[PDB]
Amino acid sequence: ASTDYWQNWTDGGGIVNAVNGSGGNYSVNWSNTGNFVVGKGWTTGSPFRTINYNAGVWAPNGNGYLTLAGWTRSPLIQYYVVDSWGTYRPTGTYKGTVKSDGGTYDIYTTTRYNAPSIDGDRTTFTQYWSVRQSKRPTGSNATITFTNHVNAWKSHGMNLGSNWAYQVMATEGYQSSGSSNVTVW
Ligand SMILES: [Zn+2]
Protein backbone atom coordinates (compact mmCIF):
# COMPACT_ATOMS: atom_id res chain seq x y z
CA ALA A 1 0.00 0.00 0.00
CA SER A 2 1.27 3.49 -0.78
CA THR A 3 1.70 6.03 1.99
CA ASP A 4 -1.38 7.56 3.59
CA TYR A 5 0.13 9.49 6.52
CA TRP A 6 1.91 12.83 6.72
CA GLN A 7 3.75 13.38 9.98
CA ASN A 8 4.75 16.98 10.74
CA TRP A 9 5.39 17.79 14.41
CA THR A 10 7.63 20.38 16.02
CA ASP A 11 7.86 21.39 19.66
CA GLY A 12 7.97 25.00 18.42
CA GLY A 13 11.72 25.59 18.71
CA GLY A 14 13.45 27.08 15.67
CA ILE A 15 12.24 26.65 12.11
CA VAL A 16 10.96 23.40 10.61
CA ASN A 17 9.92 24.01 7.01
CA ALA A 18 8.31 20.76 5.87
CA VAL A 19 6.88 20.12 2.41
CA ASN A 20 4.31 17.43 1.71
CA GLY A 21 5.43 16.54 -1.82
CA SER A 22 3.80 14.35 -4.43
CA GLY A 23 3.17 10.74 -3.64
CA GLY A 24 5.55 9.51 -1.00
CA ASN A 25 8.03 12.42 -1.34
CA TYR A 26 8.72 15.06 1.31
CA SER A 27 11.42 17.53 2.31
CA VAL A 28 12.48 19.34 5.45
CA ASN A 29 14.69 22.37 5.87
CA TRP A 30 15.24 23.19 9.48
CA SER A 31 17.13 25.75 11.55
CA ASN A 32 18.22 25.94 15.23
CA THR A 33 15.44 23.66 16.34
CA GLY A 34 14.11 22.02 19.42
CA ASN A 35 12.66 18.54 18.78
CA PHE A 36 10.70 17.73 15.61
CA VAL A 37 9.64 14.68 13.57
CA VAL A 38 8.60 14.91 9.90
CA GLY A 39 7.94 12.04 7.55
CA LYS A 40 5.66 9.95 5.41
CA GLY A 41 4.27 6.50 5.89
CA TRP A 42 1.14 4.75 7.12
CA THR A 43 -1.64 5.63 9.51
CA THR A 44 -1.71 2.07 10.86
CA GLY A 45 1.69 0.45 11.23
CA SER A 46 2.27 -3.26 10.68
CA PRO A 47 4.96 -5.58 12.11
CA PHE A 48 5.05 -7.18 8.64
CA ARG A 49 5.59 -4.08 6.54
CA THR A 50 8.58 -3.63 4.25
CA ILE A 51 9.38 0.09 4.06
CA ASN A 52 11.13 1.36 0.95
CA TYR A 53 12.72 4.79 0.76
CA ASN A 54 15.21 6.87 -1.10
CA ALA A 55 16.81 9.79 0.72
CA GLY A 56 17.95 12.00 -2.12
CA VAL A 57 19.18 14.55 0.42
CA TRP A 58 20.51 13.73 3.87
CA ALA A 59 22.27 16.78 5.23
CA PRO A 60 21.89 17.26 8.98
CA ASN A 61 24.05 19.84 10.79
CA GLY A 62 23.88 18.52 14.30
CA ASN A 63 21.51 15.92 15.74
CA GLY A 64 19.22 14.55 13.07
CA TYR A 65 18.02 10.93 12.53
CA LEU A 66 16.97 9.32 9.24
CA THR A 67 14.86 6.67 10.80
CA LEU A 68 11.80 4.50 10.70
CA ALA A 69 9.63 5.86 13.51
CA GLY A 70 6.34 4.56 14.86
CA TRP A 71 4.18 3.83 17.86
CA THR A 72 1.99 1.30 19.49
CA ARG A 73 -0.49 1.69 22.28
CA SER A 74 -1.41 -1.00 24.86
CA PRO A 75 1.25 -0.41 25.88
CA LEU A 76 2.50 2.98 24.65
CA ILE A 77 5.84 2.35 22.96
CA GLN A 78 7.87 4.39 20.50
CA TYR A 79 10.12 2.49 18.13
CA TYR A 80 12.96 3.40 15.78
CA VAL A 81 15.02 1.82 12.99
CA VAL A 82 17.77 4.41 12.56
CA ASP A 83 19.66 4.16 9.25
CA SER A 84 21.63 7.42 9.37
CA TRP A 85 22.24 10.33 11.69
CA GLY A 86 24.21 13.55 12.07
CA THR A 87 26.44 14.40 15.02
CA TYR A 88 24.81 11.98 17.48
CA ARG A 89 24.36 8.20 17.20
CA PRO A 90 21.45 7.31 19.50
CA THR A 91 22.16 4.68 22.14
CA GLY A 92 20.60 3.26 25.26
CA THR A 93 20.55 0.03 27.26
CA TYR A 94 22.32 -2.44 25.01
CA LYS A 95 20.25 -5.55 24.25
CA GLY A 96 21.90 -7.28 21.27
CA THR A 97 22.17 -6.92 17.47
CA VAL A 98 20.12 -7.68 14.39
CA LYS A 99 21.18 -8.02 10.76
CA SER A 100 18.72 -6.71 8.21
CA ASP A 101 18.81 -5.20 4.72
CA GLY A 102 22.62 -5.34 4.34
CA GLY A 103 23.32 -3.70 7.72
CA THR A 104 23.97 -4.68 11.32
CA TYR A 105 22.00 -2.78 13.93
CA ASP A 106 22.53 -2.52 17.67
CA ILE A 107 19.37 -2.97 19.71
CA TYR A 108 18.65 -0.59 22.57
CA THR A 109 15.97 0.37 25.04
CA THR A 110 15.42 3.77 26.65
CA THR A 111 12.67 5.37 28.72
CA ARG A 112 11.15 8.83 28.40
CA TYR A 113 9.52 10.63 31.33
CA ASN A 114 7.27 13.68 30.97
CA ALA A 115 7.92 13.73 27.26
CA PRO A 116 5.74 14.28 24.21
CA SER A 117 4.07 11.27 22.61
CA ILE A 118 0.97 10.48 20.57
CA ASP A 119 -0.93 10.51 23.87
CA GLY A 120 0.09 13.95 25.24
CA ASP A 121 2.80 16.55 25.89
CA ARG A 122 3.95 15.02 29.21
CA THR A 123 3.93 11.22 29.02
CA THR A 124 6.05 8.27 30.13
CA PHE A 125 6.89 5.53 27.66
CA THR A 126 9.54 3.03 26.58
CA GLN A 127 11.48 3.38 23.33
CA TYR A 128 12.73 0.43 21.27
CA TRP A 129 15.66 1.05 18.92
CA SER A 130 17.56 -0.60 16.16
CA VAL A 131 20.46 1.69 15.30
CA ARG A 132 22.72 0.88 12.39
CA GLN A 133 26.32 0.38 13.44
CA SER A 134 27.46 2.67 10.59
CA LYS A 135 25.53 5.27 8.63
CA ARG A 136 23.68 3.77 5.69
CA PRO A 137 24.59 5.22 2.28
CA THR A 138 21.80 7.46 0.99
CA GLY A 139 20.63 8.37 -2.49
CA SER A 140 19.69 4.87 -3.74
CA ASN A 141 16.57 2.82 -3.07
CA ALA A 142 16.71 1.27 0.40
CA THR A 143 14.54 -1.19 2.29
CA ILE A 144 13.78 -1.71 5.95
CA THR A 145 12.35 -5.20 6.44
CA PHE A 146 10.68 -4.32 9.74
CA THR A 147 9.68 -7.93 10.59
CA ASN A 148 13.41 -8.67 11.15
CA HIS A 149 13.51 -5.93 13.75
CA VAL A 150 10.21 -6.91 15.41
CA ASN A 151 11.38 -10.54 15.64
CA ALA A 152 14.82 -9.65 17.06
CA TRP A 153 13.18 -7.27 19.58
CA LYS A 154 10.75 -9.99 20.66
CA SER A 155 13.61 -12.45 21.12
CA HIS A 156 15.22 -9.87 23.51
CA GLY A 157 12.02 -9.45 25.55
CA MET A 158 10.93 -6.27 23.71
CA ASN A 159 7.28 -6.77 22.86
CA LEU A 160 5.28 -4.10 21.05
CA GLY A 161 1.75 -3.12 22.02
CA SER A 162 -1.40 -4.48 20.38
CA ASN A 163 -2.83 -1.24 19.00
CA TRP A 164 -0.74 0.04 16.07
CA ALA A 165 -0.43 3.77 15.41
CA TYR A 166 1.53 5.60 12.74
CA GLN A 167 4.63 4.19 11.03
CA VAL A 168 6.74 6.59 8.99
CA MET A 169 10.15 7.03 7.42
CA ALA A 170 11.15 10.17 9.27
CA THR A 171 13.58 13.00 9.67
CA GLU A 172 13.81 13.63 13.42
CA GLY A 173 15.98 16.42 14.77
CA TYR A 174 16.99 18.07 18.01
CA GLN A 175 19.08 21.21 18.57
CA SER A 176 20.18 21.28 14.93
CA SER A 177 19.74 22.63 11.42
CA GLY A 178 19.67 20.72 8.19
CA SER A 179 18.05 19.62 4.95
CA SER A 180 16.48 16.31 3.94
CA ASN A 181 14.51 15.00 0.97
CA VAL A 182 13.05 11.50 1.13
CA THR A 183 10.60 9.42 -0.86
CA VAL A 184 8.78 6.58 0.89
CA TRP A 185 6.75 3.67 -0.47
ZN1 LIG B 1 19.68 -11.49 19.58
Side-chain angles (χ1 to χ4, degrees):
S2 35
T3 56
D4 62 19
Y5 192 89
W6 170 231
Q7 171 63 20
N8 177 212
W9 173 82
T10 170
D11 67 7
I15 300 169
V16 183
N17 283 352
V19 174
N20 181 352
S22 56
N25 176 252
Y26 72 91
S27 63
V28 201
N29 294 285
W30 68 104
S31 185
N32 213 62
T33 64
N35 196 208
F36 70 86
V37 180
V38 175
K40 281 184 165 184
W42 299 269
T43 302
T44 304
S46 170
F48 307 116
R49 185 169 329 258
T50 295
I51 297 92
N52 303 280
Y53 72 93
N54 182 319
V57 176
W58 179 246
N61 185 22
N63 183 6
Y65 309 144
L66 173 65
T67 186
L68 189 72
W71 294 84
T72 68
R73 288 178 174 110
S74 303
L76 181 72
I77 299 161
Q78 190 180 26
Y79 62 82
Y80 292 92
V81 182
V82 181
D83 270 352
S84 190
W85 60 90
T87 56
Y88 181 64
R89 183 175 178 272
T91 68
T93 303
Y94 179 77
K95 307 296 286 187
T97 58
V98 58
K99 300 175 183 149
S100 192
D101 310 284
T104 303
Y105 297 74
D106 297 309
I107 304 170
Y108 303 105
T109 63
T110 56
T111 305
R112 300 281 270 138
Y113 300 98
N114 298 311
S117 74
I118 59 170
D119 280 358
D121 289 319
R122 299 299 209 192
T123 57
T124 299
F125 52 93
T126 302
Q127 303 177 290
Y128 296 168
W129 306 77
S130 290
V131 181
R132 210 174 180 274
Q133 289 182 339
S134 63
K135 295 181 184 186
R136 200 170 183 170
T138 61
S140 297
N141 292 352
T143 62
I144 297 171
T145 304
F146 187 48
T147 54
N148 292 339
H149 299 275
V150 173
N151 286 342
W153 292 352
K154 280 174 32 57
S155 78
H156 285 278
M158 292 159 64
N159 298 109
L160 287 166
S162 55
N163 180 6
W164 288 71
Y166 70 77
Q167 177 175 66
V168 297
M169 191 67 201
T171 303
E172 175 167 342
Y174 189 57
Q175 290 181 333
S176 67
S177 306
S179 295
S180 70
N181 189 306
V182 187
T183 304
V184 188
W185 68 98

Coordinates of all heavy atoms in Angstrom, one line a residue, residues 95-97 107 152 155-156, ligand 1:
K95 N 21.0 -4.3 24.2 CA 20.3 -5.6 24.2 C 20.9 -6.6 23.4 O 20.7 -7.8 23.7 CB 18.8 -5.3 23.8 CG 18.1 -4.2 24.6 CD 18.0 -4.4 26.0 CE 16.9 -5.4 26.3 NZ 16.6 -5.6 27.7
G96 N 21.5 -6.3 22.3 CA 21.9 -7.3 21.3 C 22.1 -6.6 19.9 O 22.2 -5.4 19.8
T97 N 22.1 -7.4 18.8 CA 22.2 -6.9 17.5 C 21.2 -7.7 16.6 O 20.7 -8.7 17.0 CB 23.6 -7.2 16.9 OG1 23.8 -8.6 16.9 CG2 24.7 -6.4 17.6
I107 N 20.7 -3.1 19.1 CA 19.4 -3.0 19.7 C 19.5 -2.3 21.1 O 20.3 -2.8 21.9 CB 18.7 -4.3 19.8 CG1 18.6 -5.1 18.5 CG2 17.4 -4.2 20.6 CD1 18.2 -6.5 18.6
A152 N 13.6 -9.8 16.2 CA 14.8 -9.6 17.1 C 14.5 -9.0 18.4 O 14.8 -9.5 19.5 CB 15.9 -8.9 16.3
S155 N 12.7 -11.5 20.6 CA 13.6 -12.4 21.1 C 14.4 -11.9 22.3 O 14.9 -12.7 23.1 CB 14.4 -13.0 20.0 OG 15.5 -12.2 19.6
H156 N 14.5 -10.5 22.4 CA 15.2 -9.9 23.5 C 14.2 -9.3 24.5 O 14.6 -8.4 25.3 CB 16.2 -8.8 22.9 CG 17.4 -9.5 22.3 ND1 18.5 -9.9 23.1 CD2 17.8 -9.8 21.1 CE1 19.4 -10.4 22.4 NE2 19.0 -10.5 21.1
Ligands
ZN1 ZN 19.7 -11.5 19.6

